[PDB]
Design a binder for this molecule. Structure first.
Ligand SMILES: O=c1ccn([C@H]2C[C@H](O)[C@@H](COP(=O)(O)O)O2)c(=O)[nH]1
Ligand SMILES: O=c1ccn([C@H]2C[C@H](O)[C@@H](COP(=O)(O)O)O2)c(=O)[nH]1
Ligand SMILES: [Mg+2]
Ligand SMILES: [Mg+2]
Ligand SMILES: [Mg+2]
Ligand SMILES: [Mg+2]
Ligand SMILES: [Mg+2]
Ligand SMILES: [Mg+2]
Lengths: 222, 222
């Protein structure tokens, strides 16, 4: 249903920090329609994790691990949209999402909500989806946030980064960085920041980031 | 603005024939929401032909030739949707489409129209876009229709087809199959069918289709 407001605020802080790595003055440069488009396009990636096409590889299997990654990407963009516009559940999300027909309908409705700039509702939708599917959305967020920062360090913005190397997409390495961590670990009121820092360092390890280039949890929090 | 109704009807006939190659009973198996999803996903391909991302290869150039292909793909799906539901312009398309901001807005609005199952309006939008950009939509349709059929012959539906070979995407070969043909050639009331047949054989040539496997224009027309 919902995250603790203190956890949500820390996620928002991380998101602002990441947006600032991309551009120092992102709050002036970006507009709500940018985040609508970004969510639309991640939702298309999410939809394409399923075998929806009736004319192309009809017996393909759903990439349910990639679903987690794309929902996490949507979260980054819905947090970002919410920092620019206030929006001023059971209608548009259909459970269980393990049913492919429910997933295709629900994730198409995320596109509609994005186009209406209902970013907070999109955030609520992703939280509800992670609860239904049963994955650790907060831990996924911290891990992908870290990979996002790594990508920026390694030339994503100037077109020199390569996402798939030796048969492995960078995103795939995140699953094992996160699996040691429980839901309680990453939402505990007193100790969550240390566990987020642990996730970050596991991701930096996975990409061989030199120690001097690593940004710890405190870099991101206000 | 609009095509001749006789030209539109022949396109619809070709579309029905192609849909029948994919599945004999497509008219029972498919539902309007399928075509909405298909158009959404082609519109995402269309949007991704532009350098819209502010965090990833920011100085990339638009793939304006691929725009033509993706609009043509949308047409196939909007024709198909219109065969299942009646819908029972200047608001949602913004010219010139050579302006990237106009294109991103317009093509996002195609997604909205698709989700509303306004398939005839989507068709009108594609016709208007081709008129504005200045490409031969009918010739593009016939060429991609032919490649679509070829793909089905070569295992697209069972996952054995390879779209990009030796650095060239199959779609790229279509441009040169079409460039000899004028707008008048492919819409002339008396002779258009022969010119469509010519396009088809040029596409079969490009993919080395044995003569016995080729389907001529008459296969597709009622
Ligand atoms: O201003 C931005 C731009 C991008 N992203 C992140 C969010 C997603 O997790 C990720 C998606 O990158 P792609 O793989 O689509 O390129 O980018 C941000 O957080 N802020
Ligand atoms: O029932 C169908 C399914 C697919 N297509 C065609 C339309 C598009 O031109 C093409 C897109 O194929 P992809 O490259 O997305 O897979 O498929 C049809 O015409 N009818
Ligand atoms: Mg993406
Ligand atoms: Mg992806
Ligand atoms: Mg993604
Ligand atoms: Mg496609
Ligand atoms: Mg394409
Ligand atoms: Mg396409």
């Amino acid at each position: 249903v919902s995250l603790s407001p203190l956890i949500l605020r820390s996620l928002a802080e991380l998101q602002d920090g990441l947006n600032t790595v991309v551009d120092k003055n992102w709050r002036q440069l970006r507009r709500p329609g940018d985040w609508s488009l970004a969510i639309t396009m991640e939702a298309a990636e999410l939809l394409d994790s399923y075998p929806w096409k009736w004319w192309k590889n009809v017996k393909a299997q759903p990439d349910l691990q990639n679903v987690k990654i794309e929902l996490t990407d949507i979260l980054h963009f819905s947090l970002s949209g919410a920092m620019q516009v206030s929006d001023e559940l059971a209608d548009f999300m259909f459970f269980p999402l393990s049913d492919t027909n429910n997933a295709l309908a629900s994730f198409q409705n995320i596109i509609r909500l994005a186009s209406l700039q209902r970013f907070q509702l999109v955030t609520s939708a992703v939280i509800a989806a992670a609860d239904d599917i049963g994955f650790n959305l907060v831990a996924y967020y911290v891990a992908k946030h870290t990979l996002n920062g790594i990508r920026q360090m390694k030339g994503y913005k100037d077109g020199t980064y390569v996402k798939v190397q030796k048969g492995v997409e960078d995103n795939e390495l995140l699953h094992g960085c996160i699996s040691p961590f429980s839901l309680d670990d990453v939402t505990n009121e007193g100790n969550y920041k240390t566990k987020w820092d642990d996730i970050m360092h596991r991701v930096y390890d996975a990409f061989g980031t030199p120690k001097e280039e690593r940004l710890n949890i405190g870099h991101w929090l206000k």
